[PDB]
Design a binder for this molecule. Structure first.
Ligand SMILES: Nc1ncnc2c1ncn2[C@@H]1O[C@H](COP(=O)(O)OP(=O)(O)OP(=O)(O)O)[C@@H](O)[C@H]1O
Ligand SMILES: Nc1ncnc2c1ncn2[C@@H]1O[C@H](COP(=O)(O)OP(=O)(O)OP(=O)(O)O)[C@@H](O)[C@H]1O
Ligand SMILES: [Mg+2]
Lengths: 578, 470, 41, 471, 193, 193
C-alpha cells in the first residue's frame, strides 16, 4: 500500500513524502504508533496530514501509511448506552485498557465483537434486496434494532441464517454474488446517507421548555441554533432537551467542551427515565465526547460521526435528536489547521469554506422516507459561542442564514438568574405557521390565537419600554401600566422555568395552554375593570395573581383541576367587585 | 477531447494542472477521478507554467496519479429557449424537475454585456404586485430595481412568492392598450434550504404560476460557484425573453445576502485582500453588473424589472450589502418586525419605504388620476398617527384634541385593513378604494395634500365597503 | 445625544483600526507565500 | 539515552527563535541545551522539525549567542519533570529548578509536563462543598471540590488578597455532609507567572504567617524572569498537583496568579512564528492551550484526592470581552468577578455577584450537603439585588422623590446588601452565619415578594431583623 | 498649460437669485452641491446649463444609475438654449457612465471632462463643468486601490483621495490663454454621501 | 545584583499634597503618571526632582522637548538641595535624547538611566528615576520592529513591549546592597497615550 516517511512536524500537522498516489481525505497511520490522520493537501510527492491525536515525540523518518479509505463509522447494534471519542472509539474500553487518562494509539473496535445478539430474520431465499431494506431485527435495550442492507448494495438472497444468537462479525445473510452481509456496515462520515425523499416538517419537536415549545418552536425535521455568551445556559438547555425531548434516540456531541458535562450525563442519565418507553434514559442515548483538551483535529470528526449515527437511526425508522455542543470549537479547529496550511484567511481567521461546511452539516437534518420506506427524522440543535458575546461573528451569522429557529440567549437575564434566559426580541422561529394544524388537533383549537395574543402583548410591552426608560413607570397611563404589568406576569410566570425542580423542569403543551389562557382571561378582566374605573394599584393585589404565578409548580396530573379552579377564581375576583 | 494529467497540487478548492496553456481563462472543465466520477471546475488562472482550477463540490477522492482534466466550454454559456417556461433548474442550468432537457434556440454567455446608456429610455408603466402598500405607496415601474429589505425571522419568502403569483401588467388602464402583452417571472434563489425549496415548489405548482415562470434554485449545500452563477443565468434568460420576444419579465433574486457571502468566500479562496468590512473591494461593481441588467430599451416592447430580496445582516442599514444595493437600486420596500410580531402580513412599513420611480409610472393614462396625492396623504396621516400613538401613552386619550383622536383611529385602521391584507390579491382599484375609505375618517379640510376635485369625487365612502369582506 | 455620538465615533474608530491591522497582516502573509514561490518555489 | 549528540550549525537567531539545520534526529517537542561560547547553558524546546532545520524556542535571553560557537544538545525527547512527594515545602522557579538553596529532589516518577486528557468515563462528579468563608462565594457562587473557579481582577483590585484569604480559610464541612469527620488540610500548589516582587512578597509573607509553606509547592516566575519560561510553569505545577492528588490522595488547591502574563508569552511566541491570530493578536490556538491547563482539575472515580484551581487573571481595561477572560470563562466552571465600583466604596472582598457564577454549585448545596434553603436563598438574593440595581438606574434619571415604597425598600436592600453581605473584611463566616445574614437582609422585603423561596422556608427563616446580629 | 492665472474678481451668473446673491461663485471658481432625493438637484443643474454665462457646458456623470443617466440623456436634448433658442446640446458635451461600466472609465470620467473644459477655455471661452456624484468617482478610485492592494485610510478610501480631488478641482480658474485671450473653467461638483 | 529585596515601608516624599496624601508611593515603589498633553506630567516630574527627598535624582528625557532640558540646566544650578543645602544640580543626572534626536537612542536612554540609578543605589543612596516618556521608548520599539518585519501586536507595537516595560520597572525596589548597605530606586514613569 502507499507508504512514505515524515518530512516535517509542526503541531498536529505532518508532511509526508513518498506518498504519490495518496488520495484526498484519506486516513493514514502516522509513525510507529499508527496514529490516525487525514490527508488534506497533496503537493508533488508530498501529502499534508492532520493527526487526530497528539504528536509530541514523533521524529522525522517514521513511516506514514495510507489506509486508502476515508473516515468511516461502524453502524450496527451496540451503540446505544455508549460513549465514544471523536473518531468513534469506545471510551469504556479505553479506560479498561488505559488508566484514568486517554493515551494515544489505542486501537479498539467501535462495536462489541463478543456480545451475542438475538436475530429474527425478515428475509427468505429468493427475495430481492436493495440498499436500506430490512434484513431482520435485533432487540436492544427495549428497541427493535433493524438490520439494514448497506445503502449501495443490491442482489438476491442465497441463504439467510436461522433465528438464533450470533455476533456482529458473522455473515447473517449472503447474496448470490457472494456479498457477505453482517449485522453492521461501514459508512464514510462525510457523505450524506441516502434517503428516498424529504418531507415537509409538520409535527413539533417537544423540548419540554415553555418558551421554546410555545413561542419559538422547532419541527421534528428542523434545525435550531442556541448562541450565547458563557454563563447564559446553553449546556443546561441542551441537557434539558436530551432529558425531556420527545425523540426516540438522542445523539449528544460534545465538540470541544468541558469533560465535566459528559461526566454529568454519564453519571446521571442512568438514574433517570425515558419519557416514552419508561426505561433508563441512557438506553436511548449516544455520547460523542471530544473535550477541549483532546486533539483538535477530532473536533471536526465528532460532528460527522454524530450526524452519521443520527442518519443511521433515522434510516431505522426512528426519530433522532442531534445535540452539537459547540460548532464554534469546530470552526476554531478549522482555523488552527488552516494556519498550519499557510492559507489566506477570511474574516477573523476562519477559512473560506467554513460556511459551506456548516451548511452541509445542517442540511443533513430533516424528516425523510427512508430507502426502506419508513419515516424517520433528525433534528439538529447546534450551539454557538461567540467571542465577547458578539452576534456579528462569521459563525453566528452563517448559522442565522440556515437554521429555522434562533434561540438567542441574553447576558442581562442570566445575570439576574432568570432562566431559560432567552432574549425574546432577538429570537425567532420559522416553523410556527406550518405547525398550526398539529396544535389545533393535539393541543387546543385556539392555541394559535392565544400564542399570537401573547406575542402581541410582548410587542406592546417592548414598545412601551422605550417610554418607560425615558420617563419611568409612574408617568404612563393606567392601560399602559397594565400592559407593562401583564408583560412582567408573562416573563415571570410563563416564560420563566426552573430546570432543577421536580415539576417545572418539564412542561406539557396543554399545561402551557392552560397558563396562557389564565393570563389572557386575567388581562381581559383587568382591562375591563380599568375601563370601568378600578384603580390599577388595586388590581395588582388581587389574590388570583399568586395562583397564576404558582401554576408553574403544579404537578402535571393535578394541573387540570387547578386550572379549572383558577379560571373560576379569575371570573370571581372581578365579578364580586361588579 | 484532450486530457490533461499533470496535476501537481490539490488543496481545498484548487488543483494545479501543468502543460495546460490551451485552457482559456474562465473555461469550464471536467475532472475525472480514479473511480470515474466527474467533477466540474473553472479556470481561475492560466500561466505558461501551470493553470489553476477551482473545483465545484469537494475534492475527496482526487489523487495526483489518476486525475484527468478535459475542457467543456471556453466560455460559460446557457442554452436558452422559450421552452424554458414552466421549468426549474439548479443554478448552472441543469433541470431538477425530472423533465427532458430543452433544445436551445441559442446559447448565450451568462456574463451579459452592458446596456448602452443611449439605448435606454424612461420607465413609464407600472406593474401591479397585488399588494396595497407597494401598489399605492411605493409603486413598481417596469424597468425599476426595487429591492426588499428584510430581517432574520421576517417572512420575505412568502412575500416573494405572493408577488410571483400575483404580479401582472394592466394594459387596459393605459388608454386602450393591447390585450396581449406577454408576462414572465424569473425566480432566482440563492443558498436556500430544503424547507424553503419545498415551499417554493408548492407555491408555484398550486396556483399555476409555474406555467409563466422559470426557476433557478440553488441550495445552501450546493457549491458556491453555482450560487454566483445563478443570478447571471436568471438575467440571461430574462434579457433573452424581454429583448427577443417582447416579454415583460419580472425577476426576483431571493437572497442577495447569500450571493454576497458566496462572493466573499470565493474571493478569499483566490487569495484576494478583502475590502471594507471584509467584503471584496469590487462588490459594488459586481452588484452593479447584476442590478443594471434591468431597464427599458428604445424600440423594444419588452422590459426587465428586478426585485432583489436581501436580509439586513443585523437589522443594520449601514452594512455594505444594503448600502451598496441602495446606491445601485432605486428605493426599497422595508419589512418591519413590529408589524410582524403584531400579526400583520405582509409586514411592510410604509414610512421607511421609498419608490424612486413611482412618479413616472403613476398618474393619468397609467392607473388613476388621484394616485400620487392619495399616497402622499396616506404617508402624512400615518406618520401623524404613529406620533399620537406614542404620545397618548403618557398624556392620555382625553388630553388629545379631536383631530389627534381621528389620527389614532386612522392609524389603527390603516394597519388593520390596508397593510394587513393576508394573502389576498388587491387590484389597484381595490387598494385605492381602501385608501379613500381610510381617508374618509379624517375630516375634509385635513386632506391638505389632495386636490379639491379629487376629494369631492372620491371622498365619503364608508369603510363598510371593504369591512364586510376584508 | 452628544455623549452617545462620541461613544459611537470612538467605537467606529477602534473597529476601523482592527480592520486595518487585519489587512496589514493579510498583506504580510500573502507576500510571504508569494516570495516563497518566487524564490524557493 | 546515555550519549551526548551536539548540533553545531545554527543558521538563525531572532527574538525567541533559533534555527538549527542538520537536526533531523530531534524529536518534536524535545528539550535541548544551547551552549554558547562562554559556556553558559540555556534551555529551549523544539516546536518544529524537518529535514531542513529545527525551530527552537529559547527559554532565556539570546544575548551572547553567536552562529559560530553556539551548539544545541538534547536533554530528552518529551519534557518531563521529576516528581517526588518530598516536593512539599520546596520553592522552584519557572522551569522547575530549586531556588531555595536545597539540593535537587530525587524523583519517584518522571511525568510529562503536558500530561494526558482525563477520560470522561473515569471522572467523578464534583459534589463536595468547600467553605471559603466569604459570603458571596459560599452562598451565591458556591465552590465545590474539583472545580475551576477563576478570579477576574483588574489593574489595582485586591485579587491576591482574596486568593490568600480563600487558601487561609478553606475547609470542607464533614458535619453538614454526613461523611467521615476528618480534618485533613489542603496541599497548595502556587504558580506565579510574571509576578512582581510586591505581590510575591505579600503571598510569601501570608503563607509564612499561616504556616502553609510546609504543605505548599511554589513555582515562581517573576517579572524580571524570562518571558518564554512562562509556557512551562503552569504545566509543571499541574503535573505536580495531579501527581499528588491521584497518586497520594491529596486534596490539592492550585493558584495560577496571572494568566494574562501567560497569554502574553503565548502571543510573543505565536507572533514570532507567524501564526494566524484570533482577536487582538492572540494566537488562534489560545483556547485549546488554555484548556490544556484548566481542564487538568477534577475528581476521579475510585480515588480520594482532588484538584481545585483558582486562577487569577487581570482584565486589561476591566473588559470582560477581552480574549483572555472570554476564553477562560468559556473553559472554566464559573468566575468570581471583582468590581472597581465596590472597591472605590471600600467594600472588601469587592466581588460583584451579578457577573459572577459557579456552574457546579447545584451539586454541592441543598439537603444533606449545606442546608435546605440555600439554593432558593441565593436565587432570591440575586433577584433582589438586580431589582435594586435597576432602581438605582431609574433614580439616576428620575430622582428619589418619585420612588414608590417598594422601590425604596429595594434600594435600601441593595445598599444594606453591599454593606453587610458583600463587605466582610478579613472574617471567616460559616455558611450558617452567611445564610443568617442573607435572611436578615431579605427580611427587609415584604413576605410576598419572595417568589423564589418556598413557603415552608419562608415560615422557618423569615422575620429576623439585622439588629439581632450587630447592635 | 496657460500663460497666467487671474484672481476671481468676476461673477458666474447662474441666473438664480439665491446662488448669484447670497452664495455667489466667481468665474473660474469651484462649488459643491449635495444630492438628496427630492431636492431638485436635477432642475438646478439644468438651470445652470440653460442660464449661466458660460459659452460651453461639459456635463460628467461619472457613475450614475442607469435610470438617472437615461433621464439626463433624455432631458438635455429637449432643452432650448435661451440665448439663441436653438438646442442647448449644441454647446454641451455629455460624458455618461453607468454603474456597470468598467471602473477605469468611471475613474477617468472627470479627467476627460476637465481636459475638454480646459481645451475650450484655451479657445478663449468660459466653460462650466458639472460633475455629478463625485462620490461615485471616489468609489471607483477605492475599488481600483483595492485591486492594487493598497493600505486604505479612513473609510477604506486610499490615502491619496484628497490629492486627486485637489488635482481635479485646481484645474479650474480664470486665465489668460497661451493665445493671449481670456477664458475660464468653473466647476460645480456634487457630493452624495 | 543585590543581596535581598525588602518591603517598602518609608514614604517617597514628593512635596505635592495630592500625591503625598491620597496616593502615596513608597521609597522603593513604582508609579505611573499618564495623561494627555498639557496636563502637567513634565511639571509634576520637575517638581518631584526639585523637592523630593531622594539623595540622587536621575532625570531621563526620552523623545521629549529640548527646552525642558535647557530649563533644568539653566534653573537647577541656582536652586538649593532640600536636605544637603547645596545646589540642586549636584544631585541630578540628566539623560537627554530629545524628540528630534536619533529615535533608537530612546531605548538606550531608558536603560542607561536605570543602570546609573542602580549604581547610586549600590552606593547606599535613595534614588528617584523619572522617565519623561516611556511612550517614546515604545515608539522606538515599534519602528525597529517595523524594520525587522516582525508580526505586530495591538496598534503595531511588538509583542514583547510588556516584557521590556516589566523588566525596566522591576529594577525598582528597596534592597540590601551587595556591600550590605540599604538602598532604593523609585521609578516614576510618564505615559503619553
Ligand atoms: N426651480 C424649481 N422650480 C419649480 N419646481 C421645482 C424646482 N426645483 C425643483 N422643483 C420641483 O421639485 C422636484 C424636486 O425633486 P426631484 O425628485 O425632481 O429632484 P431631482 O433633482 O431629480 O433629485 P436627485 O438629483 O437627488 O435625484 C422637481 O421634480 C420639481 O417637481
Ligand atoms: N502644578 C502646576 N502648577 C502650575 N502650572 C502647571 C502645573 N502643572 C502644569 N502646569 C501648566 O501646564 C503646562 C503644561 O504642563 P506640562 O509641561 O507638565 O505638560 P505634560 O503633561 O508633561 O504634557 P506634554 O506631553 O505636552 O509634555 C505647564 O507649562 C504649566 O503651564
Ligand atoms: Mg511633558
Amino acid at each position: 500500500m502507499i507508504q512514505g516517511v515524515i518530512q516535517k512536524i509542526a503541531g498536529p500537522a505532518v508532511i509526508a513524502k513518498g506518498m504519490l498516489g495518496a488520495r484526498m481525505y484519506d486516513i493514514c497511520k502516522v509513525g510507529e504508533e499508527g496514529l490516525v490522520g487525514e490527508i488534506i493537501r497533496l503537493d508533488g510527492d508530498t501529502a499534508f496530514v492532520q493527526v487526530y491525536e497528539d504528536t509530541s515525540g514523533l521524529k522525522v523518518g517514521e513511516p506514514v501509511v495510507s489506509t486508502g479509505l476515508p473516515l468511516a463509522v461502524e453502524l450496527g447494534p451496540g451503540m446505544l448506552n455508549g460513549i465514544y471519542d471523536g473518531i468513534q472509539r469506545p471510551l469504556e474500553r479505553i479506560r479498561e485498557k488505559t488508566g484514568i487518562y486517554i493515551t494515544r494509539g489505542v486501537v479498539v473496535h467501535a462495536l462489541d465483537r463478543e456480545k451475542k445478539w438475538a436475530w429474527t430474520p425478515m428475509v427468505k431465499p429468493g427475495d430481492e434486496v436493495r440498499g436500506g431494506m430490512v434484513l431482520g431485527t435485533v432487540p436492544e435495550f427495549g428497541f427493535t434494532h433493524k438490520i439494514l442492507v448497506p445503502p449501495d448494495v443490491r442482489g438476491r438472497v442465497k441463504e439467510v441464517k436461522p433465528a438464533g444468537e450470533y455476533t456482529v462479525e458473522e455473515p447473517v445473510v449472503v447474496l448470490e454474488d457472494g456479498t457477505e452481509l453482517k449485522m453492521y456496515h461501514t459508512w464514510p462520515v462525510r457523505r450524506a446517507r441516502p434517503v428516498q425523499r424529504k418531507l415537509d416538517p409538520n409535527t413539533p419537536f417537544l423540548t419540554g421548555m415553555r418558551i421554546l415549545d410555545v413561542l419559538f418552536p422547532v419541527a421534528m425535521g428542523g434545525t435550531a441554533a442556541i448562541p450565547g455568551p458563557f454563563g447564559a445556559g446553553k449546556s443546561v438547555t441542551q441537557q434539558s432537551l436530551a432529558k425531556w425531548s420527545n425523540a426516540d434516540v438522542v445523539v449528544y456531541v460534545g465538540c470541544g467542551e468541558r469533560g465535566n458535562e459528559m461526566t454529568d450525563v454519564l453519571v446521571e442519565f442512568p438514574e433517570l427515565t425515558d419519557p416514552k418507553t419508561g426505561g433508563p434514559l441512557m438506553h436511548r442515548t449516544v455520547l460523542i465526547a471530544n473535550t477541549s483538551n483532546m486533539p483538535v483535529a477530532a473536533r471536526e470528526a465528532s460532528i460527522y460521526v454524530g450526524v452519521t449515527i443520527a442518519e443511521y437511526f433515522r434510516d431505522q425508522g426512528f426519530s433522532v435528536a442531534l445535540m452539537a455542543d459547540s460548532t464554534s470549537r469546530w470552526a476554531e479547529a478549522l482555523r488552527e489547521i488552516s494556519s498550519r496550511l499557510e492559507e489566506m484567511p477570511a474574516e477573523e481567521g476562519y477559512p473560506p469554506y467554513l460556511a459551506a461546511r456548516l451548511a452541509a452539516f445542517y442540511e443533513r437534518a430533516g424528516k425523510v422516507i427512508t430507502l426502506g420506506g419508513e419515516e424517520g427524522a433528525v433534528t439538529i440543535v447546534g450551539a454557538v459561542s461567540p467571542p465577547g458575546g458578539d452576534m456579528s461573528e462569521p459563525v453566528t451569522q452563517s448559522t442565522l442564514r440556515i437554521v429555522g429557529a434562533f434561540w438567542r440567549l441574553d447576558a442581562s437575564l442570566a445575570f439576574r438568574r432568570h432562566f431559560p434566559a432567552i432574549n425574546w426580541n432577538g429570537s425567532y422561529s420559522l416553523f410556527t405557521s406550518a405547525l398550526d394544524p398539529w396544535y389545533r388537533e393535539n393541543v387546543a383549537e385556539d392555541y394559535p390565537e392565544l400564542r399570537d395574543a401573547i406575542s402581541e402583548l410582548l410587542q406592546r410591552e417592548a414598545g412601551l419600554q422605550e417610554i418607560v426608560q425615558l420617563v419611568g413607570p409612574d408617568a404612563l397611563q393606567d392601560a399602559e401600566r397594565l400592559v407593562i404589568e401583564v408583560g412582567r406576569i408573562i416573563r415571570e410566570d410563563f416564560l420563566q422555568q426552573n430546570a432543577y425542580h421536580e415539576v417545572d423542569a418539564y412542561c406539557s403543551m396543554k399545561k402551557a395552554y392552560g397558563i396562557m389562557k389564565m393570563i389572557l382571561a386575567f388581562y381581559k378582566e383587568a382591562e375591563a375593570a380599568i375601563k370601568r374605573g378600578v384603580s390599577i394599584d388595586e388590581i395588582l393585589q388581587l389574590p388570583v395573581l399568586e395562583r397564576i404565578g404558582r401554576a408553574r409548580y403544579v404537578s402535571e396530573e393535578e394541573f387540570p383541576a387547578y386550572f379549572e379552579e383558577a379560571m373560576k377564581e379569575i371570573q370571581g375576583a372581578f365579578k364580586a367587585l361588579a | 477531447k484532450k486530457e490533461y494529467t499533470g496535476i501537481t497540487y490539490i488543496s481545498g478548492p484548487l488543483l494545479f494542472v501543468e502543460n495546460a496553456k490551451d485552457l482559456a481563462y474562465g473555461a469550464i472543465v471536467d475532472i475525472k477521478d480514479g473511480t470515474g466520477r466527474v467533477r466540474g471546475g473553472q479556470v481561475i488562472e492560466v500561466s505558461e507554467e501551470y493553470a489553476v482550477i477551482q473545483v465545484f463540490e469537494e475534492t475527496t477522492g482526487l489523487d495526483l496519479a489518476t486525475t484527468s482534466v478535459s475542457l467543456v466550454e471556453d466560455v460559460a454559456r446557457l442554452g436558452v429557449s422559450k421552452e424554458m417556461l414552466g421549468r426549474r433548474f439548479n443554478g448552472i442550468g441543469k433541470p431538477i424537475d425530472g423533465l427532458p432537457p430543452i433544445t436551445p434556440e441559442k446559447r448565450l454567455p451568462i456574463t451579459g454585456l452592458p446596456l448602452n446608456p443611449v439605448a435606454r429610455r424612461k420607465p413609464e408603466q407600472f406593474i401591479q404586485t397585488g399588494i396595497s402598500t407597494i401598489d399605492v405607496m411605493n409603486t413598481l415601474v417596469r424597468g425599476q430595481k426595487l429591492p426588499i429589505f428584510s430581517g432574520s425571522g421576517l417572512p420575505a419568502n412568502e412575500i416573494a412568492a405572493q408577488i410571483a403569483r400575483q404580479a401582472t401588467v394592466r394594459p387596459d388602464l393605459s388608454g386602450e392598450g393591447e390585450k396581449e402583452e406577454p408576462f414572465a417571472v424569473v425566480f432566482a434563489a440563492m443558498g436556500i434550504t430544503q424547507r424553503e425549496l419545498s415551499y417554493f415548489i408548492q407555491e408555484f405548482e398550486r396556483t399555476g404560476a409555474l406555467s409563466r415562470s422559470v426557476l433557478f434554485l440553488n441550495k445552501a449545500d450546493d457549491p458556491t460557484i453555482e450560487r454566483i452563477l445563478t443570478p447571471r443565468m436568471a438575467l440571461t434568460v430574462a434579457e433573452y425573453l424581454a429583448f427577443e420576444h417582447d416579454y415583460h419579465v419580472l425577476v426576483i433574486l431571493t437572497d442577495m445576502t447569500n450571493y454576497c457571502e458566496a462572493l466573499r468566500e470565493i474571493g478569499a479562496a483566490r487569495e484576494e485582500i478583502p475590502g471594507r468590512r471584509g467584503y471584496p473591494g469590487y462588490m459594488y461593481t459586481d452588484l452593479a453588473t447584476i442590478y443594471e441588467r434591468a431597464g427599458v430599451v428604445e424600440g423594444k416592447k419588452g422590459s426587465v424589472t428586478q426585485i432583489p430580496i436581501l436580509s439586513m445582516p443585523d437589522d443594520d442599514r449601514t452594512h455594505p450589502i444594503p448600502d451598496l444595493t441602495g446606491y445601485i437600486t432605486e428605493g426599497q420596500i422595508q419589512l418591519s418586525r413590529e408589524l410582524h410580531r403584531k400579526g400583520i402580513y405582509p409586514p411592510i412599513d410604509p414610512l421607511p419605504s421609498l419608490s424612486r420611480l413611482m412618479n413616472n409610472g403613476v398618474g393619468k393614462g397609467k392607473t388613476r388620476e388621484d394616485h400620487k396625492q392619495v399616497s402622499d396623504q396616506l404617508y402624512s396621516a400615518y406618520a401623524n398617527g404613529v406620533d399620537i400613538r406614542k404620545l397618548v401613552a403618557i398624556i392620555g386619550e382625553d388630553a388629545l384634541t379631536e383631530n389627534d383622536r381621528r389620527y389614532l383611529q386612522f392609524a389603527d385602521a390603516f394597519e388593520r385593513f390596508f397593510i394587513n391584507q393576508g394573502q389576498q390579491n388587491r387590484s389597484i382599484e381595490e387598494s385605492l378604494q381602501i385608501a379613500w375609505a381610510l381617508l374618509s375618517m379624517l375630516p375634509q379640510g385635513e386632506l391638505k395634500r389632495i386636490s379639491k376635485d379629487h376629494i369631492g369625487k372620491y371622498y365619503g365612502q364608508k369603510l363598510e365597503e371593504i369591512w364586510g369582506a376584508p | 445625544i452628544p455623549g452617545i455620538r462620541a461613544q459611537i465615533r470612538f467605537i467606529q474608530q477602534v473597529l476601523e483600526q482592527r480592520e486595518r491591522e487585519d489587512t496589514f497582516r493579510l498583506k504580510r502573509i500573502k507576500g510571504k507565500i508569494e516570495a516563497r514561490e518566487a524564490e524557493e518555489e
